Amino acid sequence: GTTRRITMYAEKISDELYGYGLAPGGATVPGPVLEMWEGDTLEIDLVNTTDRVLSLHPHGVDYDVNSDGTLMNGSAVMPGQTRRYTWRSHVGYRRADGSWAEGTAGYWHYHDHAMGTEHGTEGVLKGLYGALVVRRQGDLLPKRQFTVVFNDMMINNRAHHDAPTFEANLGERVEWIAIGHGSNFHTFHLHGHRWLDNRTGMRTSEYDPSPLIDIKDLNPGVSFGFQVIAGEGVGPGMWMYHCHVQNHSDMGMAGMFLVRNADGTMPAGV
């Protein structure tokens, strides 16, 4: 395993927007995609540049209670201070009892657990969230990578006319990481594209039973990811992604996946 040691900055970006970044002044919502391979360790020094108590907490990775990012376990970060969090991971292994301890690989995420409540309600509300991708040896890697977060009624905390436009060129391998947050229920749908409902979105063997889907529940705390080939079998153009809850899409949880020509040019019809 590789041990990586990074610094992340929690910053107030603007009114009611807080985010994580890899350099001072660099915070974004969603935060940076953090990538690991099974067995790797990530040591993160979280620098809290804000006037608020907040934290950093992951899903799916191995962390002990001192790294859990909760007030209860003394894992939060006071204003101006720095806390080291350690996230480990593992390849699968055989247990003494003969069962299999599964490797960490998956599309996971990280977020605030301390701001405004012991569940991080205000931190999550205001943007402290990002994707954590743990890969298995041999996995295919993307040309383009998009994080889509349905947070209450917002996509990536954008204003309601502002939903993110994600862009790829026809034929490129594109990875989507979907994360739900907040208090509302949602279904994430992508026009013109589909994926297998399993870890990677692609068939692992001849025996894989997983259904092909174009839509999946994305409720608070849930994450999943997949890869598609942009425009495969469907061509270039402006391809909608949206929450399929009708009241939600009508209020603006809908955005565009723009698939350009293979050469990067804008498709004629647009």
**Between residue 158 and residue 197, which ones bind a second copy under the rule CB under 8 A?**
173, 180-183, 185, 187, 189, 191-192, 194, 196
Task: State in angstroms the smallest separation of the CB of 224 from Cu ion.
Answer: 14
Closer to Cu ion by Cβ: residue 143 or 244: 244
* Site of tokens 């990538």: 35
Q: Judged by CB under 8 A, does residue 73 bind a second copy? A: yes
Q: Judged by CB under 8 A, does residue 130 bind a second copy? A: no
Which residue in the set 2, 25, 51, 95 belongs to the binding site for a second copy (CB under 8 A)?
95
Q: What is the DSSP string of the chain?
A: --EEEEEEEEEEEETTEEEEESSTT--BSS-PPEEEETT-EEEEEEEE-SSS-B--EESSSB--GGGS--TTTT--B-TT-EEEEEEB----EE-TTS-EEPP--EEEEEE-SSSSSTT-HHHHHTT-EEEEEEEPTT----SEEEEEEEETTEETT--TT-PPEEEEETT-EEEEEEEEESS---EEEETT--EESSSSSS--STT--PPEESEEE--TT-EEEEEEETTTTT-SEEEEEEE-SHHHHHTT-EEEEEEE-TTSPPPTT-
**Between residue 231 and residue 250, which ones bind Cu ion under the rule CB under 5 A?**
243, 245, 248
As beta bridge partners, residue 196 has: 212
- Taken in order 86, 221, 201, 243, the sign of the CA dihedral is negative
Q: Judged by CB under 5 A, does residue 213 bind Cu ion? A: no
Closer to a second copy by Cβ: residue 89 or 147: 89
Q: Judged by CB under 8 A, does residue 224 bind a second copy? A: yes
**x/- letters, 245..264, toward a second copy (CB under 8 A):** xxxxxx---x----------
Stretch that binds a second copy, among 6-14, 18-26, 39-47, 214-222 (CB under 8 A): 214-222
- Binds 71, which of Cu ion, a second copy, none (CB < 5 to 8 A, cut-off by type)? none
Which residue in the set 51, 99, 161, 263 belongs to the binding site for a second copy (CB under 8 A)?
99
**Number of shown-chain residues binding Cu ion (CB under 5 A):** 6
Task: State in angstroms the smallest separation of the CB of 249 from Cu ion.
Answer: 7
Closer to a second copy by Cβ: residue 82 or 185: 185
Which residue in the set 104, 145, 157, 169 belongs to the binding site for a second copy (CB under 8 A)?
104
Which residue in the set 13, 17, 71, 213 belongs to the binding site for a second copy (CB under 8 A)?
213
Query: Which residues of this protein are in contact with Cu ion, per CB under 5 A?
Result: 186, 191, 221, 243, 245, 248
